[PDB]
């Protein structure tokens, strides 16, 4: 199953405020109108994470829970675990013996996402649409998110980073965690010099992808949205 990613996967490329300036950034985003793979959960295969993932997720009950990023998903290989416990956000990097079908039970009943770990170098703890973006550059993982209300709308919405983590892991494949007793969409990112128009409040509220079509390329060249 596939679908079309209208105006999604747009994140603040830099840590820096800019106001009412049409700023052009070359960086790997989700290309406009990309062709985003849809999964239905009424289904958790091991997908590549070669150059980032626009992991959108619309769901109504927060059953989408966790993210798993491995090279072989075995004990020996290195596995990052972003597990969102609905009580406290948790992250770990630990090299795990993974049960093929990890999940949480719930009034909570089960926590059955793994079997064992050997060594590792981190742990951290703390009607709707929820977008997320995950990238790894030179061992620096960067996560962006956005929670917007909708009961994929071609409505533009900026994405702001929340966490970096120096995993240093050579990631190429990933996963997603679901809690039994929920559609979610994976895109792939590529280097696409987006030209983004911050408004007066400094929020990215429109953008053009330079390589979409001749109109977009022209817009890019003139540093303008109207031509």
């Amino acid at each position: 199953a596939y679908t079309n990613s209208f105006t999604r996967g747009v994140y603040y490329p830099d840590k820096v405020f800019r106001s009412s300036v049409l700023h052009s950034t070359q960086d790997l985003f989700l290309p406009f109108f990309s062709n985003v793979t849809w999964f239905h959960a009424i289904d958790n295969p091991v997908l590549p994470f070669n150059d980032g993932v626009y992991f959108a997720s619309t769901e109504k009950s927060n059953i989408i829970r966790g993210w798993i990023f491995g090279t072989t998903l075995d004990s020996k290989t290195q596995s990052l675990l972003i597990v969102n416990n609905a009580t406290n956000v948790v992250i770990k990097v630990c090299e795990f013996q993974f049960c093929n079908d990890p999940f949480l039970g719930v009034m909570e009943s089960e926590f059955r996402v793994y079997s064992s770990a050997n060594n590792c170098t981190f742990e951290y703890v703390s009607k709707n649409l929820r977008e997320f973006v995950f990238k790894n550059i030179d061992g620096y993982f960067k996560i962006y998110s956005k929670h917007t209300p909708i009961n994929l709308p071609q409505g533009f919405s900026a994405l702001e980073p929340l966490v970096d983590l120096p995993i240093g892991i050579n990631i190429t494949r990933f996963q997603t965690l679901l809690a039994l007793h929920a559609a979610y969409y994976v895109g792939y990112l590529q280097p696409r010099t987006f030209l983004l128009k911050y408004n007066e409040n400094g929020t990215i509220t429109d953008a053009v992808d330079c390589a979409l079509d001749p109109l977009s390329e022209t817009k890019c060249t003139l540093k303008s949205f109207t031509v």
Binding site: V16, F17, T121
Partner: protein, 284 residues
Amino acid sequence: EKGIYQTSNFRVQPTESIVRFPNITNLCPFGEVFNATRFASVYAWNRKRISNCVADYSVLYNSASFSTFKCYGVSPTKLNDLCFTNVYADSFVIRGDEVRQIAPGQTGKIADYNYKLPDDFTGCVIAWNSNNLDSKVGGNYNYLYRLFRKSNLKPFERDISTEIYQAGNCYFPLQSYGFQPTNGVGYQPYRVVVLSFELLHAPATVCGPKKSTNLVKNKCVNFNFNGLTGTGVLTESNKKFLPFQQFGRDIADTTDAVRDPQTLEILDITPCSFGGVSVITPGT
């Protein structure tokens, strides 16, 4: 001759210097980087993050106990007065003649097989002797390094593979360190550590030892925000920084607003009033 002549430039001078640093007293532990009992093998070099700390690099510097302490993209005496997001401390032990190999654009066994620095390396490389501690009679073969592998490495990548190398002819790609205290300086161990600084506009967490002073507004100041130096008048503003942004930027990529590291408040930075000075003279 009679006329109006554009002679000079009127530029208000700053009155005082403002230095504002996040107030953290945690002095971060270089000690077990440098009196670390063991560093791992150079192929499995040890990473450690350094953040949320105050680092006196000068006391490290004048220690004079290091054979080679040399710095790129930054200067040892200058880098006391700088604030960084992260400090990456990579340490290991390598041979003697090959300490020069730890630099960008450098090749050889360890560089092309164990550790590369990028061309745009913005850190500091240090190394000292370890005869008393890394060279034992009869041989200390704990230290190991990579010999054979398919390709060349990218900056700061770790390869800890033990797969038997395929020449065509099968050899162990890793060979160890036969180390006597009796040998020449060329065949004398070196304790090596390199710090690469993550220069980012994210909230800096490792900062030099400097007293952050009081903040004064609406008067020409010579300011320094987390090592970002400048001059101007700082006023209250309404540029709604979102909680993650720190340095508002101007068209010319000069910082135009800053979130104060101590009180997370935004300050607009306007260059101190300046202009041209022209002189009107009837012909002398």
